[PDB]
Structure formats: structure tokens, C-alpha cells
Amino acid sequence: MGLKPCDYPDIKHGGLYHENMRRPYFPVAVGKYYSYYCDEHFETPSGSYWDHIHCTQDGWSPAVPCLRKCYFPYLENGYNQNHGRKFVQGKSIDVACHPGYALPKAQTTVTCMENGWSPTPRCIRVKTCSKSSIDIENGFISESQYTYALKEKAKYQCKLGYVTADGETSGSITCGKDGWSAQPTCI
Numbered sequence: 001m002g003l004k005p006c007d008y009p010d011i012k013h014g015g016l017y018h019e020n021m022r023r024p025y026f027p028v029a030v031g032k033y034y035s036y037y038c039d040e041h042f043e044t045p046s047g048s049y050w051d052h053i054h055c056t057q058d059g060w061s062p063a064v065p066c067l068r069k070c071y072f073p074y075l076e077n078g079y080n081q082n083h084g085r086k087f088v089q090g091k092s093i094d095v096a097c098h099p100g101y102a103l104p105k106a107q108t109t110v111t112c113m114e115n116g117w118s119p120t121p122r123c124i125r126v127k128t129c130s131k132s133s134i135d136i137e138n139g140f141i142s143e144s145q146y147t148y149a150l151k152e153k154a155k156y157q158c159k160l161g162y163v164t165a166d167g168e169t170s171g172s173i174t175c176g177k178d179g180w181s182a183q184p185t186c187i
């Protein structure tokens with residue numbers, strides 16, 4: 001009999017051409033296909049603004065007729081190589097931020113979703129702790145960098161004969177939003 005029919009395709013971010021003619025012939029028998037378009041900022045799986053939606057035994061095909069088209073923005077606090085390039089939904093792109101700057105928070109790639117880039121492509125200044133801020137007696141900071149990023153550690157070694165609070169000959173402190181995890185002590 002009938003391996004029966006399909007209903008009016010609810011195209012998200014698009015629509016059917018000749019909408020006034022097609023409605024309703026629906027339900028529509030399988031095999032029947034319709035030309036359709038995608039809205040601005042969106043594209044068909046062919047990479048064009050228009051295509052055809054086929055009524056299959058398992059529904060309408062493509063299942064996602066309209067895919068988002070992401071434009072890569074300018075990164076003021078990062079290195080630019082893709083500014084102006086377009087990417088189809090589901091694509092991941094590497095993001096190189098300047099030293100001291102990161103993505104939020106803190107991925108290394110930005111992915112194109114139906115709702116746009118995820119997360120937003122922008123390099124934000126990272127919170128830091130200063131070494132000039134550390135204070136250790138009977139030991140020294142054996143690293144040795146000036147700026148430490150959140151969650152980054154500062155290594156320290158004790159002087160010959162002195163031990164830390166573990167009590168090992170060396171340890172480390174952590175940089176958090178509130179400053180350093182603590183003071184290094186070598187007794």
C-alpha cells in the first residue's frame with residue numbers, strides 16, 4: 001500500500017520556496033522533494049544558499065538542511081591568520097593568543113555552533129601572581145619567571161639542611177585568584 005507520507009518540513013533557519021503553492025499538498029508522498037533556502041548567516045550541506053529537501057522513509061533529508069556559517073573575527077590581543085574566513089557548523093579552529101592572553105576559559109580552539117562561535121573568539125588577559133610578591137627565607141625561587149598565570153606554580157628549593165613543610169627539600173606554591181596559595185617556608 002503506502003510507505004507513507006511526510007509532513008510540512010519545519011526548516012529552522014530556512015524555508016521552502018513557492019511556499020504558497022506547496023501548502024498544503026502535505027502530507028507529501030515519499031520521493032517528493034522540494035527546493036528550499038537558508039537564511040542569511042546559514043548554508044545548505046552543499047555550501048550554497050539553496051538546495052532540495054527529500055522526503056525519505058525516515059523523515060526529511062537532509063536532517064539539518066540549514067547549517068550555520070561562522071565568520072572569523074579580528075583578534076586584537078592574539079595572532080591573526082583566519083580573519084575573514086568562513087566556516088561551516090561543526091568546525092573547530094585553533095586560536096593563538098598573545099602571551100598573557102587566553103580564550104575563555106581557557107580553551108585553545110573555537111567551534112562553530114548553530115548559535116555561533118563557542119566560545120566567542122577573543123583573547124582575554126589572564127590573571128596573574130607576581131614573583132616579586134613571593135617571600136621565602138632559607139630558600140629561593142628556582143624557576144625563575146616574573147609573571148605566573150592563574151593555576152601556574154612557582155617552584156622553590158630550600159638551602160642546604162633546610163626542609164619544607166612536607167617536609168621535603170623543595171616544594172611549590174599555587175597562583176589563584178586571591179594571590180599565592182601561601183608562603184614557602186624552609187625550616
Ligand SMILES: O=S(=O)(O)OC[C@H]1O[C@@](COS(=O)(=O)O)(O[C@H]2O[C@H](COS(=O)(=O)O)[C@@H](OS(=O)(=O)O)[C@H](OS(=O)(=O)O)[C@H]2OS(=O)(=O)O)[C@@H](OS(=O)(=O)O)[C@@H]1OS(=O)(=O)O
Binds near residue numbers: 070074
Ligand atoms: O566579531 S565581531 O563582533 O567584530 O563581528 C565581526 C563581523 O562584523 C561584521 C558583521 O558581522 S555580522 O554582523 O555578524 O554579520 O561587520 C562588522 O565588522 C566589520 C569588520 O570586521 S572586523 O573583524 O571587526 O574588522 C566592519 O567592517 S569595518 O567596519 O571594519 O570595515 C563592519 O562595518 S561595516 O558593516 O562593514 O560598515 C561591522 O558591521 S557591524 O558594525 O558589526 O554592524 C563582519 O564583517 S562583514 O562580514 O564584512 O560585514 C565581521 O565578520 S568577519 O568574519 O569577522 O569579518
Ligand SMILES: [Cl-]
Binds near residue numbers: 075076121123
Ligand atoms: Cl581578542
Ligand SMILES: [Cl-]
Binds near residue numbers: 137138141
Ligand atoms: Cl628567597
